[model samples]
Target chain A: GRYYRVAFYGQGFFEEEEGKEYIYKEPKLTGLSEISQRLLKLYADKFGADNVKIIQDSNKVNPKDLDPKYAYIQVTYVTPFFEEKEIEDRKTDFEMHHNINRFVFETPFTLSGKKHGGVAEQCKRRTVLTTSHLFPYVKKRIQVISQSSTELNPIEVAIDEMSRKVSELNQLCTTEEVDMIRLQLKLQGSVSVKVNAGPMAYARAFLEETNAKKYPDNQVKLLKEIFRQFADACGQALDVNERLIKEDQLEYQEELRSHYKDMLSELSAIMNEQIT
Target chain B: MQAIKCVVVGDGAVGKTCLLISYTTNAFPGEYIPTVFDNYSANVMVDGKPVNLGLWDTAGQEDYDRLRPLSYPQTDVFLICFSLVSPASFENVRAKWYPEVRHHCPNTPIILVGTKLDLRDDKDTIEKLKEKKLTPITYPQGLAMAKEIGAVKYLECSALTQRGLKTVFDEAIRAVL
Candidate 1:
């Protein structure tokens, strides 16, 4: 599917008819795919690249204008586009963990690909838009363009790519690795993105699976460390994309081009560790 | 012109399809159709701002238990409906609807609706419930379930009379904002 990355700018309340036809007299970009040549040019167009004004009200957004089939990066605005709810008010690990585990067992998908023909596997194709503020954590994964309660940060953008790339990486891993990736992705979506399975939960799963009657603290720590680096790669790639958007600099674009490579490289490294 | 995806889920016989039909068409459906209502898009002015209210209607049956949630991702809000006079349907609000939605889209705001309001006070409807030792769910009962399920709001509406119908979608759009 051909998706043109576009942005809506300024403060006018959008009218559906005009907004559908509205384009920046140009078109655009992203972290989510193989960084297809089509997508490369979409970003290269620099549509609304210099516009710093973030559209504050989402209610006036035209649904048709944001059609997923056509627009890939729905509306790119100024960053720090994400933040967490106050820690005091967040849901506890006990409450969120059970749901996270069950979500993994319940949802199922098929992983498929063929050599030489290019991969035809299920992947999340998206352009950002804020669906709601209630599920702020899930919004961290899905929504990015619309205005919200705080200063939206680049790390928030990184978190989405981290979860997405790892989930896609599952298709190429061992069964246990597949399940673990699904578990972590679900946790990152529902609970705190930074929260890993604690010793209690991770150890329990390890014991149940291997019947080893021992906790692999080192392995657990290793997994956590990998996530930290994975997150850093996503942030760095997006930071370059953000700078490229704002400055329209060729240097930043050169850095932005490596996002797909950097994400897949970390994913492959994680895959090797899992396979062994 | 922001888009809001609101999916309506409930027991099959309850007015899930009717609710969407009434709100979008402004006229009551002549016959009960089990689950034929497709995605309905209405360009509405809510709070003086245009909203592309995308309403997704789902079949509420045990057969659809697995297939229904496929429509849920990227959903902004949910409307869980139960018939006011059907005690079984009301019971399922706690037993089934709430759990199913909460399981899939836990953070999506849910608006609990008591459908078939016009029949709640109808003599024949009360007699039908009475024959089975049942009665229409009271407003307070609806409110209580709303609280229990952590719904953003509790609403009652009759598709036949169009009473309190518009507010249902209005509140749905408001909840997401």
Candidate 2:
């Protein structure tokens, strides 16, 4: 299957056509309105209406729009985007992604690759976005254009490499594929990326630009500070992905820890190589 | 205003009906007449709660298997009795009674009892019984087995002696409450 990754920024409450907010009170919505309504009522009776709130805005969007032939819902707090100042001052995006993936992997239905190949696709997509768009966007915005043509040349080469890796990961789901690629894209998605023009030069560029322009140095002491807070926010998404992967693999009796370790090492190497 | 219901479950010829009859009306039947599931109800106060123990003495016949699951929802507690003299009757508690009982009433507390303890002293020794081709069995072994399976309580009693009979009923009442 072709792997697609998409990311949305900011949080808005979903509003249904009737202008009523959607609440996810039930464990899952099976798409049968009557049955879902009845189940929602039962849950409300058991747990009270206050405990359940439907998500309204994205309700109208077809499930296929989110991901073709695969749909999953995730709820994330809007704190990081709202507090962009805190994120810029903290430099916590990498940490945030790690924690988010872990949380995602833990939730009952969201277990990573099992549900719609959710986490794997998300990780590959995020890596692509980070390399192709976010990193370059940061370099341009921060005005950190390399002084030497050699430096610029290598950056382009690395971007090309990252893009290839993302494409390969998009196609590869198992540990064997990860080993063959010799990069830990999945594990890097779960760990903190230190901000520097190293192997993860793209991430470093994004962080530096985001910090310098968005928040400014007077506001935050270290880039790590902003990264930490950003990581804290995005960490939830990472957690959800992590848990989904863990549980899905477990149900099938598939071992993932060794593969995860390999992925982490590969991610670190990628980051280190970017500096050279 | 409603009374809690209890069910008697055990192997054939374990005197389940006799034990229930003894507790309910202090009556005992000399002749072994197979009991139908539609038999009688006994009202008793357990833990200050009124309970209508519907004593269903299932005919020890194999045809009753289909009816067992249907009987469970109404039961608040189960009295699983086994005869001390018959070791084979004890094994049936897990094989026959538990599966049937748990299928419908998964959470009901089951109290295991070894009946006919009064005949313990008159029972033949294992060695002598083997010479005569009879197996000597005791109540302790059955009680031990019951305890191992986390039964609410293990009781050894004889209707004739009334030994441990009241305690068994009281425990059942307490468990339901």
Candidate 3:
């Protein structure tokens, strides 16, 4: 059986307006006529025009027209063959990565070409977006752990407290109003625990540095240890969730509760390492 | 023995060319030259049946857009690649590339691939985003696309590390055979 496949490739930039439709401006053959002319000159030099067959299309003439028997090149800017818009909401991921200590930050206006906004408004939006996105990553991460391990146990109480603090940060930013200082503390506490869990879980915590500096190796090692413990604890917490789901217990549906327990364990592990 | 002809398609820099080179040659070029319809051939036994695989790697640039419709007729398996590193490339695969292939060759087996898994060092960023409770939807989006496009299978591979290449070919051969 014969199989046919084609792929589209190119370099371009994206531009947006408040209410106008987005336009993708691909470079046309008219724009690249000079290169085409040069190629034509090369084609003529190598193979005579009589031997060349140039097939003209909407964009540019096909160089294969120059020579049907000899190898030739072709160039043209064809409009996009198909297009669709898959809503990709990365606002939460952006927040996690940046580690903005404040509850509020600016989101680029999808319509208005503005850069910054009120921190309070930004915090509210960020919280809503982040919470929605994080639920799945956390749940999935836990699920994988449950599948790998035996003797499932509930996450400890300390880890539960940390999870509450992390979720509270999301709640306060989303539903309740909190002062800047409190928000910063909440963010700091949440991030510190996250870093201990796994590099990926808290990788978004360092988006604020304007300068580059190397941390001491001891600190780096300490961070890695915290991450390892967090991973272990998170795995355990997920097993607990899976067991509850399998049993169809409404209590197991309490993801936030499990999340808090895991966070607290992560924090406790980190602090213990620091003291040791 | 009859050879199966397969075409790899996607947006530029999605590692379509690299995946082809890696699968066919077991070599990856340090620098990628935009593939303008490069052909690679390999022989493999499937279900103990010996078959020749004629693979074509198409250029992803818009300038080569005309070639796609023309090339779609002869393709057996269509490998649609998107880089996890670029959200735009991922978007293009769903919106622009997949639909074109479906319209041109509706029954062809399509595989959705996420390349450059090794370059992902932004776990912190990904995690923080998760903390904020937003959908870090890059990986999921690619998988969802595979489902939406009626793809035979979906995979995430780091061409640099050869992470998912074996599974990619194994699945493709299974579907084609």
Candidate 4:
């Protein structure tokens, strides 16, 4: 089975106008792997090679004030690859990961460009493709959290009834990602514990700069690390899912699924600690 | 009383978030607070009717290409923005933003906005654009884009100076109302 992918990247600003129609004359690629090479070649070969344009107006600056170090590549590819059910699940999961990056990383370069191919491209050109001025602030905050952090350490309730409802809705949702939805629904139904949205949610309610000193800085630090590690784990998990989608494989394996539980329960414990 | 979901969409650094912050808060945001950009709601009296204006700000970078549509499902109107000084962002109002928004949100009213109104005539800003053989987008040019995209109205605003900022949202609410 063969898969087709179209990828476009430019190191310079696009000199395109509102009404004019144009294409890059000739786009070149270097240091990319065989798959990318074939993809680019396929693009040129399918649509007249002359029409496959990659224009770089090196003299012009991108109006967005994008970092000079990074180039953005937009991919519009065709893939009849994954199983129908797996593909359906992958779409929402991928969207969730994308939303996470868009919200979590305010800086432009944190996630960089998307659909990176392999380690060589991913390690070098892909990572540094975008740079944000807030790196210093982010690192400073991370350092603050790390120094303040020490260590960190959930729930079966109405299990028989809830599990049945959860499993039914889980299948109805047609995705394993519905666990978050399930937990949220369960929390909504419960009258015991007040559901806290996120770490900062409670902080905004109670923890003020006036009384901030009462709580240990390490508590905040550990929570910060816990969230960061969770974010990193999810990103890696997303990358694995992306690979599976490309290869036409299933969603998370049992081991990976359990790790997902481990992260979720770990965060739940920290949330529970907030009240205790 | 009534909640209106107004999503602001445009290219990066085109003053989309700045516009919202300036309209909702009197003090202009000095920093790019991405966290604050989400789910900002302000109660305002528009045309003498109380409305809870829900402002949704989207990431304009390419990294958010896949995820942006998730925020569009329930949007009542869109403020597709561009910079008066940045010709690329201006061009993208028609080239990129308009088409993407229309594709996802067909029949939704769009307000074409020219951001950074102060910068259009600023000598330094003009000099920088001229150096690159570019010029600030003219008012006529903006109106033409609005017409071309079938936007309900064309507006120019400066978030820094707070010029014509109020009308942008008022029109956004009016379009939905």
Top candidate, metric TM-score: 4
lDDT of 1 at A198: 20
Runs in model 4 deviating more than 4 A are A1-276, B30-37
Q: Which candidate achieves the best DockQ against the true structure?
A: 3
Ranking by lDDT: 1, 4, 3, 2
Determine the backbone clash count of candidate 3.
Answer: 54
Candidate 1's displacement at residue A137, Å, is 52
Which 10-residue span in candidate 3 chain B carries the lowest summed lDDT?
A: B28-37
DockQ of 3: 0.03
Q: Candidate 2: how close is chain B to the reference, as a TM-score? A: 0.79
TM-score of each: 0.39, 0.35, 0.35, 0.44
A120-174, model 1: which lDDT tens digit per residue?
A: 1212212233322222133122222342232212222223333444453333232
DockQ of 4: 0.02
Most lDDT-accurate candidate: 1
lDDT of 3 at A144: 9
Across A17-124, the per-residue lDDT of candidate 4 in tens digits comes to 211211111111111122333434555664445444432221112436544333332221111223356446666644432211100111111124432222111111
- For candidate 2, lDDT tens digit of each residue in B71-164? 3444667878777766667778777776667776678898888888755566353454466665635656776777765688888877654457
Predicted complex 1: DockQ? 0.01
- Interface C-alpha RMSD per candidate, 1 decimal: 20.7, 33.1, 22.6, 19.0
Give the clash count for each candidate. Answer: 12, 65, 54, 4
For lDDT, candidate 2 versus 3, the one ahead is: 3
> Which portions of model 2 miss their true places by more than 4 Å?
A1-276, B28-38, B47-50, B124-136
